[PDB]
C-alpha cells in the first residue's frame, strides 16, 4: 500500500496530475492517472475533451517526484518543498492528445541520481500500448538555494 500520490509531492491540487501510486522501488516508479472530466486532469483538457500530448512531460516529471518522495519518507528525511524540471530529451508521442477515458500508466526508470539532481528514462502506456517514450532531468532545490539562484 501507498499513501495518496499527492502525499509524496511538494505539489498540491490542482497541480497534482497523477491519481494512483502503483509501484515504487530503488530504480523504478509506476503511477497511474485517468483522462476524465471529474479527475485531476480535467483543468488541462482541450476543447474536444482530450489531454494534449505535451502534458506527458508533466506526468513523467511528477512520477519522478513520487519516486523521490517515497524514498525520503522511507528514509525519515524531511519532505521536499520544491521540484523542478530542468530538461527533456526525445519526448515522442504516438498521438497528439490522450483521449477521454484513457487509463494512463506512467513508468519511469532511474538512470542517475544524487542529493538533488535526477535523470530518468520514461514510458507512458495505455493497456500495454506504448504511447510516449522520453528522458527527463529534474532538480530538487532548497528554498534558500532557489533564492540564491533567482538573485545571483
Amino acid at each position: 500500500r501507498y499513501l495518496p500520490v499527492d502525499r509524496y509531492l511538494p505539489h498540491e491540487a490542482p497541480m497534482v496530475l497523477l491519481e494512483q501510486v502503483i509501484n515504487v522501488s530503488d530504480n523504478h516508479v509506476h503511477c497511474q492517472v485517468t483522462v476524465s472530466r471529474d479527475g485531476v486532469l480535467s483543468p488541462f483538457l482541450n476543447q474536444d475533451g482530450h489531454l494534449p500530448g505535451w502534458f506527458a512531460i508533466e506526468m513523467m516529471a511528477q512520477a519522478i517526484g513520487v519516486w523521490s518522495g517515497w524514498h525520503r519518507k522511507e528514509r525519515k528525511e524531511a519532505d521536499s518543498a520544491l521540484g523542478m524540471l530542468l530538461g527533456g530529451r526525445a519526448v515522442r508521442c504516438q498521438v497528439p492528445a490522450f483521449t477521454q477515458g484513457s487509463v494512463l500508466d506512467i513508468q519511469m526508470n532511474l538512470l542517475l541520481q544524487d542529493e538533488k539532481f535526477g535523470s530518468f528514462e520514461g514510458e507512458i502506456s495505455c493497456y500495454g500500448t506504448v504511447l510516449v517514450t522520453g528522458r527527463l532531468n529534474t532538480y530538487q532545490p532548497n528554498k534558500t538555494e532557489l533564492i540564491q539562484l533567482i538573485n545571483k
Binding site: 490542482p14 494534449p52 524540471l85 530542468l86 530538461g87 527533456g88 530529451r89
Partner: protein, 112 residues
Amino acid sequence: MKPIEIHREQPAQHEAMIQLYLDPTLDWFRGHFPVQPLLPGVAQIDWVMHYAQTLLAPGWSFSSIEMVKFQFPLQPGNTLLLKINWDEKKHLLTFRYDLDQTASQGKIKLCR
C-alpha cells in the same frame, strides 16, 4: 490557464514575438508550490503550442519535444519575451523564453 498578453509581433509569417506577464492569480501557480510559486515547465510548452497552432502552423498537431531546457526559474511578477520560429519543411518549431536572461529554450516536432 493563459497568461496576460502585453504585446505581439510577427515580423515574418513563420515567426512570432510575444510579451507575456505572469500574474500571481494564474492557476498554474496554485499548489505549485506553497513555499514558492514557480511556473511549471509544461505551462511554457503549453503556450508555445497555443501561439504555434493559432499564428504559425494552423492544423498541425503535437508530435514530440526533441529537446527542452529550463535554465532559470520563473515566478509571478516576471515579464517574458517568447520567440517562436516555425520551419514547415523541417516540421520543426523552435522557441526561447527570455526574461524581459534566457529562461528556457526548445525544439518541438509537429505532424499534420
